[PDB]
Amino acid sequence: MPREIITLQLGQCGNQIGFEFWKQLCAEHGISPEGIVEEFATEGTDRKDVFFYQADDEHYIPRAVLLDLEPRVIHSILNSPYAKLYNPENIYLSEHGGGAGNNWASGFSQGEKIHEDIFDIIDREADGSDSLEGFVLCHSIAGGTGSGLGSYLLERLNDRYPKKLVQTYSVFPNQDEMSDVVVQPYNSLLTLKRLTQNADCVVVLDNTALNRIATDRLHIQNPSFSQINQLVSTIMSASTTTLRYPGYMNNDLIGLIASLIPTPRLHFLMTGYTPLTTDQSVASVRKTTVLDVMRRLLQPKNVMVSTGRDRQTNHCYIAILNIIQGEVDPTQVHKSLQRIRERKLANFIPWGPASIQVALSRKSPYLPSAHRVSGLMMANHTSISSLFERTCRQYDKLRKREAFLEQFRKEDMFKDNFDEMDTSREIVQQLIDEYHAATRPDYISWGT
Amino acid sequence: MPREIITLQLGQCGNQIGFEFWKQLCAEHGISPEGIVEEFATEGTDRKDVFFYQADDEHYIPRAVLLDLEPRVIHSILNSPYAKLYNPENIYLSEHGGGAGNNWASGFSQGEKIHEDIFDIIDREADGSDSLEGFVLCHSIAGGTGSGLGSYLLERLNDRYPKKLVQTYSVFPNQDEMSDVVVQPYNSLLTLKRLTQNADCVVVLDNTALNRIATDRLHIQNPSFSQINQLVSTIMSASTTTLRYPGYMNNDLIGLIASLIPTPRLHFLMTGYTPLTTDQSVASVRKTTVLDVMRRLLQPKNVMVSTGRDRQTNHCYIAILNIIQGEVDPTQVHKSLQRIRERKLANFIPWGPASIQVALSRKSPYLPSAHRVSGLMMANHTSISSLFERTCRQYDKLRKREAFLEQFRKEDMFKDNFDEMDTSREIVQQLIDEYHAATRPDYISWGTQ
Amino acid sequence: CCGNLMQTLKKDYRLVEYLQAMRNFFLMEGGDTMYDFYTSIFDKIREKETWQNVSFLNVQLQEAVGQRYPEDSSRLSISFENVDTAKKKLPVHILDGLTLSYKVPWPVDIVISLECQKIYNQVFLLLLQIKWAKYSLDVLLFGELVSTPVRQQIHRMFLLRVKLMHFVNSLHNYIMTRILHSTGLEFQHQVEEAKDLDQLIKIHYRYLSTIHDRCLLREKVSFVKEAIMKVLNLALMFADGWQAGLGTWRMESIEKMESDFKNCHMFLVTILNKAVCRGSFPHLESLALSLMAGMEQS
């Protein structure tokens, strides 16, 4: 049986990101927003049971749980054509609609109030899943609702599925955009805390890098928060296509992530995609080669993590996996590997075998690809520590400054102190050092 | 892999020259105005990546950058059938469209205003360039837009690629026509300043000399600026044939130019083209031999530079490179060089060894050649100083009268003084003196304080 | 019968295609790709990178061929042996460890014998050495010399470099066009006229013998080969000084290099005159005249 994945949508921003992810998955699998398979979805080569459940004998419903502390996003989903994609018993909407006030603690408290309902939803989805692998949480770490609700979801997944993997999508704040969520560093700290304690894998999504990609690659002059969340959902979809479109390799989530997670704590992954094309730029079919793709992937503009220039750590890739989707020529893959090796596009850990893995996958026949050849890279790269170190430094600065904590102080997690944020910052600092260690032979002990 | 070249078109004249160059290259390579290879372009032996980039799987886009301070010329280019040939991301147009007012300093200030956009275009082209050697600037030195924009482009190329060579296609002002732009010599001086300081090689194209050559060689009584641009495009095509038809010689820019440039200061090149024919005279295929080809190339009526008869200085060729394209017998090339030396058809520098280098090249298979043998001459000739001396005399004549300087005084570079023009005049005077010295054995001490 | 055999050999065994590949690789007919290759090689030598790695050289060669001649990329193979630079003082001779191999199918391998393959590889090696010297002289950047304060000495060194470059380029052009290109055209014409396989073998052997003669490989030209090697060594020392720039090349050292170049040129001219008067290499007179062509009589 397929390894089913439960999608957790947390807070307003997280629920929007989850909704856009489910829309993209439906489009790739030819699932209508109502849960009905489109007539064009004739390619039974995709693993729908990994990401979708059947609501009836005909309707496939995404295994997505939409949880928000603000009613705007959840109500927009329930008023959208995608209202039938989510399990209604897995949808919690705050009656007050006031959100978390950009306070992680308020979102966490809202998750705690729906903790029983959320874990009942997760268990129901697992029983509706023939071979549920674990839970995947889609949220933003920078807001209040999506961050706190994401931490709550990670906690409840750990409580309900303690032997199952819990992956998180933790959005790091945009450093080029002024975040309206002043408590984002506190929110980031709460999300990093939950990723360390209650999530099994945290994919760090730096909104600064997403914005950079949107500007240079997607030609988006001013990426909206909705546009950033949709870019993140598209990147996650492309990286997970081999899980959602079963093939010869990477047929399970644990097999895919095993190469990526050197230590149980060192589960912070960076992503890369090549070739990057905007949906609008479909007109010019650029003859992008696999070698050209691999060359573009090594550009920091194509890395889905906005790492600061750390001068102290000799950042390197711990591991690199490139998942390529679409029409791929094996000779082009070979030329790509040749160009990557000759150009030394990845530096690997000295403590274990590491390389740039290349997987070739067919594209979804139901999803139009703006690129003749596309690929996602998921990589563990010590330069992600510079993003993680920056997130940790911001967390420590917010907790030490109690910035925007008054909205969080209404919730018990942040009411008296920000010690959970400071412990999260310390854990993230140790993670950054381990990633720097992961560039070093001492990587065998990285994350200890 | 090909050494990609970014073409920089500066001001109205430069942009027109670039447009005509791209048209000629498209015609020679069988590239459609949209960038699509024509079905007749079956000879996959050309290196498009040297001069063109692929915009899509079908469209080849010229590595050309069109820069102007006045919108009229850029809009006229974008309204032509060739609008789709160039990559649009490499096109920077000044929003004000006002041009430089025939002021080099104004053109430079406009370049500074479009500096960010221009350097972003240049960087985009560099990433689109597999092995970018450097930038080629097409501009006029007499106007404001082409001159100032050319100086700006030279400055920014020197800043961004200080270790890379910078060749320019620099249109020199017509010296036989009275310019209505009284400050043109000031503009020309500023352009010569930038060529001396920020360009590595300046090919001077005198529109007066172009008209004279068209009259004597092309039988064109009044060469239009468009006709001059088409002649320049033909010259560029012939120079790129070895890129499109790889062969035994001149397969790289450094290999081609190394023999021609003995010293960094002696970077003023003269050009020659062969066969020169009038459009009507294509009919008679003369069985020209390599010796006959070289003899026809040696006619001043076929030289695209009108050097004055200096009676005081024994001007001589510093170096000559003959690039011959087409069906060439090696024994005929050898006999041609032998006859040229025996006939003393070229005077060489007295201070060092100098000769006419001869390269035999295949023609591009994608461009039908009406001539069994074609040839480019590259020559370093001390008589080019007479062009430089004439430019200096014009500068001194304009600067001494401050004529039309108020248009330059509007721009910050010339608002307070003309010190950039005076330094340009001094550098050009030293260059002229060295070129005259370079015709003499005392060239060993030429340029010594 | 012989006509049928020759037709079959031309059509099924791609003999002409094999000769064209030999020209592309051994004769550097792929001038753009081989130019980029030799430029990368000369840059690696200039960067003091390890070029004597057969694996690195073979990877770069396979990438160069696969970019432009992917079908031929599988038949060509290159090996690199580290040349003892202490024994082979000329930087061009660092390349003498390179072994290029081309995969000739049966029965065409009967024509491209191991001795034929050895001769082709020797010609390839000579061409590679010439290309290395050429790139080393062409890649001499004036900016590398600009660091030294002696403007007049810098200019004189640049002019001496220009003169030496003109001489070396003239020799290279003589070999490529008057020897290599002319002999290639002759070989192609003779192969077109080849009526039988024995006639084709004889034509190929004549072509190879002509190259070997023009390559000064005969014992009769050993003294000439050594003189040529001396001149090439002078050229290599000039290229090394150019790479070191005028900051390392002092005016005394520039003048000394110019003197050594002039002395070598005089010695070469005298050797050529003795050979011409001996009548042993009358074709070299045109090459000798070309090498003295455009050189100022110092």
Short mmCIF file of N, CA and C in Angstrom, two decimals, chain B residues 155-248:
data_model
loop_
_atom_site.label_atom_id
_atom_site.label_comp_id
_atom_site.label_asym_id
_atom_site.label_seq_id
_atom_site.Cartn_x
_atom_site.Cartn_y
_atom_site.Cartn_z
N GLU B 155 32.90 53.03 -19.57
CA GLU B 155 33.18 53.11 -18.14
C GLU B 155 32.62 51.90 -17.41
N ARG B 156 31.37 51.53 -17.70
CA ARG B 156 30.74 50.44 -16.97
C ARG B 156 31.33 49.08 -17.36
N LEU B 157 31.72 48.90 -18.62
CA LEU B 157 32.42 47.69 -19.02
C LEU B 157 33.78 47.58 -18.34
N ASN B 158 34.50 48.70 -18.23
CA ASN B 158 35.77 48.69 -17.53
C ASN B 158 35.58 48.37 -16.05
N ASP B 159 34.51 48.90 -15.45
CA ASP B 159 34.25 48.63 -14.04
C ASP B 159 33.85 47.17 -13.81
N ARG B 160 32.98 46.63 -14.66
CA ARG B 160 32.46 45.29 -14.42
C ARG B 160 33.41 44.20 -14.91
N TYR B 161 34.08 44.42 -16.04
CA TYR B 161 34.97 43.43 -16.64
C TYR B 161 36.38 44.00 -16.79
N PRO B 162 37.00 44.44 -15.69
CA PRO B 162 38.30 45.12 -15.82
C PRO B 162 39.40 44.23 -16.34
N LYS B 163 39.25 42.91 -16.26
CA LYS B 163 40.24 41.98 -16.77
C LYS B 163 39.87 41.44 -18.15
N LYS B 164 38.73 41.83 -18.68
CA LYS B 164 38.26 41.38 -19.98
C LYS B 164 38.56 42.44 -21.04
N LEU B 165 38.78 41.97 -22.27
CA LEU B 165 39.03 42.89 -23.36
C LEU B 165 37.73 43.59 -23.75
N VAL B 166 37.85 44.86 -24.14
CA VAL B 166 36.72 45.64 -24.63
C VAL B 166 37.07 46.16 -26.02
N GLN B 167 36.43 45.60 -27.04
CA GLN B 167 36.50 46.12 -28.39
C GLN B 167 35.26 46.97 -28.65
N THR B 168 35.44 48.04 -29.41
CA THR B 168 34.34 48.92 -29.79
C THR B 168 34.27 49.06 -31.30
N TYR B 169 33.04 49.21 -31.81
CA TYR B 169 32.82 49.71 -33.16
C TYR B 169 32.39 51.17 -33.00
N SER B 170 33.36 52.07 -33.11
CA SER B 170 33.18 53.47 -32.79
C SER B 170 33.09 54.27 -34.08
N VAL B 171 31.93 54.87 -34.33
CA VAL B 171 31.76 55.68 -35.53
C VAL B 171 32.37 57.04 -35.24
N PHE B 172 33.41 57.38 -35.98
CA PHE B 172 34.07 58.66 -35.88
C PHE B 172 33.33 59.70 -36.72
N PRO B 173 33.34 60.96 -36.29
CA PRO B 173 32.57 61.98 -37.00
C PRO B 173 33.12 62.17 -38.41
N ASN B 174 32.23 62.53 -39.32
CA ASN B 174 32.67 62.88 -40.66
C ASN B 174 33.53 64.13 -40.60
N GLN B 175 34.73 64.04 -41.16
CA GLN B 175 35.66 65.16 -41.10
C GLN B 175 35.55 66.06 -42.31
N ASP B 176 34.90 65.59 -43.38
CA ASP B 176 34.72 66.39 -44.58
C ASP B 176 33.45 67.22 -44.54
N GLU B 177 32.43 66.79 -43.80
CA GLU B 177 31.23 67.59 -43.61
C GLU B 177 31.39 68.53 -42.42
N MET B 178 30.95 69.77 -42.61
CA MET B 178 30.79 70.71 -41.50
C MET B 178 29.68 70.23 -40.58
N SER B 179 30.03 69.83 -39.37
CA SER B 179 29.01 69.43 -38.40
C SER B 179 28.24 70.65 -37.92
N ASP B 180 26.91 70.56 -37.97
CA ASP B 180 26.07 71.58 -37.33
C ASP B 180 26.23 71.58 -35.82
N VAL B 181 26.75 70.49 -35.26
CA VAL B 181 26.98 70.37 -33.82
C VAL B 181 28.36 70.96 -33.56
N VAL B 182 28.38 72.26 -33.24
CA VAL B 182 29.66 72.94 -33.04
C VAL B 182 30.43 72.29 -31.89
N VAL B 183 29.72 71.69 -30.93
CA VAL B 183 30.38 71.04 -29.81
C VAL B 183 30.72 69.58 -30.12
N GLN B 184 30.46 69.12 -31.35
CA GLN B 184 30.81 67.76 -31.73
C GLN B 184 32.27 67.45 -31.44
N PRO B 185 33.21 68.36 -31.71
CA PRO B 185 34.60 68.07 -31.36
C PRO B 185 34.78 67.89 -29.87
N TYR B 186 34.00 68.60 -29.05
CA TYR B 186 34.02 68.35 -27.61
C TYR B 186 33.45 66.97 -27.31
N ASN B 187 32.31 66.64 -27.93
CA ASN B 187 31.75 65.30 -27.81
C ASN B 187 32.73 64.25 -28.30
N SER B 188 33.35 64.50 -29.46
CA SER B 188 34.33 63.56 -29.98
C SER B 188 35.50 63.41 -29.02
N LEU B 189 35.93 64.51 -28.42
CA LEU B 189 37.03 64.47 -27.47
C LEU B 189 36.66 63.63 -26.26
N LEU B 190 35.46 63.82 -25.72
CA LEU B 190 35.03 63.03 -24.57
C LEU B 190 34.95 61.55 -24.93
N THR B 191 34.49 61.24 -26.14
CA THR B 191 34.44 59.85 -26.57
C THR B 191 35.84 59.27 -26.71
N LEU B 192 36.78 60.05 -27.26
CA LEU B 192 38.17 59.61 -27.35
C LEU B 192 38.78 59.42 -25.97
N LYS B 193 38.43 60.29 -25.02
CA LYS B 193 38.84 60.11 -23.63
C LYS B 193 38.40 58.76 -23.11
N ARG B 194 37.12 58.43 -23.30
CA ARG B 194 36.61 57.17 -22.77
C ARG B 194 37.24 55.98 -23.49
N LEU B 195 37.44 56.10 -24.81
CA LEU B 195 38.12 55.04 -25.56
C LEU B 195 39.56 54.85 -25.08
N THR B 196 40.23 55.94 -24.72
CA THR B 196 41.61 55.84 -24.24
C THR B 196 41.65 55.23 -22.84
N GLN B 197 40.70 55.58 -21.99
CA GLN B 197 40.77 55.19 -20.59
C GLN B 197 40.01 53.90 -20.30
N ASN B 198 38.87 53.69 -20.96
CA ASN B 198 37.97 52.60 -20.60
C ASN B 198 37.76 51.58 -21.71
N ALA B 199 38.10 51.91 -22.95
CA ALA B 199 38.13 50.94 -24.04
C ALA B 199 39.54 50.42 -24.25
N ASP B 200 39.63 49.17 -24.71
CA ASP B 200 40.93 48.58 -25.03
C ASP B 200 41.29 48.72 -26.50
N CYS B 201 40.30 48.82 -27.38
CA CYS B 201 40.54 49.04 -28.80
C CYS B 201 39.39 49.84 -29.37
N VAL B 202 39.71 50.91 -30.09
CA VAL B 202 38.70 51.75 -30.75
C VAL B 202 38.95 51.68 -32.25
N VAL B 203 37.99 51.11 -32.98
CA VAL B 203 37.98 51.15 -34.43
C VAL B 203 37.25 52.41 -34.86
N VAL B 204 37.97 53.35 -35.46
CA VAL B 204 37.39 54.63 -35.87
C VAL B 204 36.71 54.46 -37.22
N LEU B 205 35.41 54.75 -37.27
CA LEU B 205 34.63 54.70 -38.51
C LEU B 205 34.19 56.12 -38.86
N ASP B 206 34.89 56.74 -39.80
CA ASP B 206 34.60 58.11 -40.23
C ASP B 206 33.53 58.10 -41.31
N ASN B 207 32.36 58.68 -41.01
CA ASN B 207 31.28 58.73 -41.99
C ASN B 207 31.69 59.44 -43.27
N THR B 208 32.61 60.41 -43.18
CA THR B 208 33.17 61.00 -44.39
C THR B 208 33.96 59.96 -45.17
N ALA B 209 34.77 59.17 -44.46
CA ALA B 209 35.54 58.12 -45.11
C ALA B 209 34.62 57.02 -45.62
N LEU B 210 33.57 56.71 -44.86
CA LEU B 210 32.59 55.72 -45.32
C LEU B 210 31.93 56.17 -46.62
N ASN B 211 31.52 57.43 -46.69
CA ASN B 211 30.93 57.96 -47.92
C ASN B 211 31.93 57.92 -49.07
N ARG B 212 33.18 58.30 -48.80
CA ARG B 212 34.21 58.26 -49.83
C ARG B 212 34.43 56.84 -50.35
N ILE B 213 34.48 55.86 -49.45
CA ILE B 213 34.68 54.47 -49.85
C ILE B 213 33.48 53.97 -50.65
N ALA B 214 32.27 54.30 -50.20
CA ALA B 214 31.07 53.93 -50.94
C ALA B 214 31.10 54.51 -52.35
N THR B 215 31.58 55.74 -52.48
CA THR B 215 31.67 56.35 -53.80
C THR B 215 32.70 55.63 -54.66
N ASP B 216 33.91 55.44 -54.13
CA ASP B 216 35.00 54.89 -54.93
C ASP B 216 34.89 53.38 -55.10
N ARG B 217 34.42 52.67 -54.08
CA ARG B 217 34.40 51.21 -54.14
C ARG B 217 33.01 50.64 -54.40
N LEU B 218 31.98 51.17 -53.76
CA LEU B 218 30.61 50.72 -53.98
C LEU B 218 29.88 51.52 -55.06
N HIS B 219 30.51 52.56 -55.60
CA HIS B 219 29.89 53.42 -56.61
C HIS B 219 28.58 54.03 -56.10
N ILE B 220 28.53 54.33 -54.81
CA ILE B 220 27.38 54.98 -54.19
C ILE B 220 27.72 56.46 -54.08
N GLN B 221 27.01 57.30 -54.83
CA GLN B 221 27.33 58.72 -54.86
C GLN B 221 27.10 59.38 -53.51
N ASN B 222 25.97 59.08 -52.86
CA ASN B 222 25.67 59.61 -51.53
C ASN B 222 25.36 58.47 -50.57
N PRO B 223 26.38 57.94 -49.89
CA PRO B 223 26.12 56.86 -48.93
C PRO B 223 25.25 57.35 -47.78
N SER B 224 24.11 56.68 -47.60
CA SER B 224 23.25 56.98 -46.46
C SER B 224 23.85 56.40 -45.18
N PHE B 225 23.41 56.95 -44.04
CA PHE B 225 23.76 56.34 -42.76
C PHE B 225 23.32 54.89 -42.72
N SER B 226 22.16 54.59 -43.31
CA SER B 226 21.71 53.20 -43.39
C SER B 226 22.64 52.38 -44.27
N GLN B 227 23.12 52.97 -45.37
CA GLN B 227 24.05 52.26 -46.24
C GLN B 227 25.39 52.04 -45.55
N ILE B 228 25.84 53.02 -44.77
CA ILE B 228 27.06 52.85 -43.99
C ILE B 228 26.88 51.74 -42.97
N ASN B 229 25.72 51.71 -42.32
CA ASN B 229 25.43 50.65 -41.35
C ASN B 229 25.39 49.28 -42.03
N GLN B 230 24.87 49.22 -43.25
CA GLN B 230 24.86 47.95 -43.98
C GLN B 230 26.27 47.52 -44.38
N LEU B 231 27.13 48.48 -44.74
CA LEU B 231 28.52 48.15 -45.00
C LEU B 231 29.22 47.64 -43.75
N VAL B 232 28.96 48.28 -42.61
CA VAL B 232 29.56 47.85 -41.35
C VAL B 232 29.05 46.46 -40.99
N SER B 233 27.76 46.21 -41.20
CA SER B 233 27.19 44.89 -40.94
C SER B 233 27.81 43.83 -41.84
N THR B 234 28.06 44.17 -43.11
CA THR B 234 28.76 43.24 -43.99
C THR B 234 30.16 42.95 -43.47
N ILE B 235 30.84 43.98 -42.97
CA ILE B 235 32.18 43.79 -42.43
C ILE B 235 32.14 42.88 -41.21
N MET B 236 31.18 43.12 -40.31
CA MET B 236 31.03 42.28 -39.13
C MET B 236 30.72 40.84 -39.51
N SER B 237 29.85 40.64 -40.50
CA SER B 237 29.56 39.30 -40.99
C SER B 237 30.82 38.61 -41.48
N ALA B 238 31.61 39.31 -42.30
CA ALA B 238 32.84 38.72 -42.80
C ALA B 238 33.80 38.39 -41.66
N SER B 239 33.85 39.26 -40.65
CA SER B 239 34.71 39.00 -39.50
C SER B 239 34.21 37.83 -38.67
N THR B 240 32.91 37.55 -38.71
CA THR B 240 32.33 36.46 -37.93
C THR B 240 32.18 35.18 -38.73
N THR B 241 32.54 35.20 -40.02
CA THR B 241 32.40 34.00 -40.83
C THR B 241 33.21 32.86 -40.23
N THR B 242 34.41 33.16 -39.73
CA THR B 242 35.25 32.15 -39.10
C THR B 242 34.63 31.64 -37.81
N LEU B 243 33.73 32.43 -37.22
CA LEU B 243 32.96 31.94 -36.08
C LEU B 243 31.86 31.02 -36.57
N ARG B 244 31.28 31.35 -37.72
CA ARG B 244 30.20 30.55 -38.28
C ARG B 244 30.74 29.41 -39.12
N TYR B 245 31.94 29.58 -39.69
CA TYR B 245 32.64 28.52 -40.40
C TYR B 245 33.99 28.30 -39.72
N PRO B 246 34.06 27.41 -38.72
CA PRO B 246 35.32 27.24 -37.99
C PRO B 246 36.40 26.72 -38.93
N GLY B 247 37.62 27.20 -38.74
CA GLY B 247 38.69 26.69 -39.58
C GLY B 247 40.07 26.59 -38.98
N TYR B 248 41.09 26.59 -39.85
CA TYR B 248 42.46 26.39 -39.41
C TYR B 248 42.98 27.57 -38.60
#
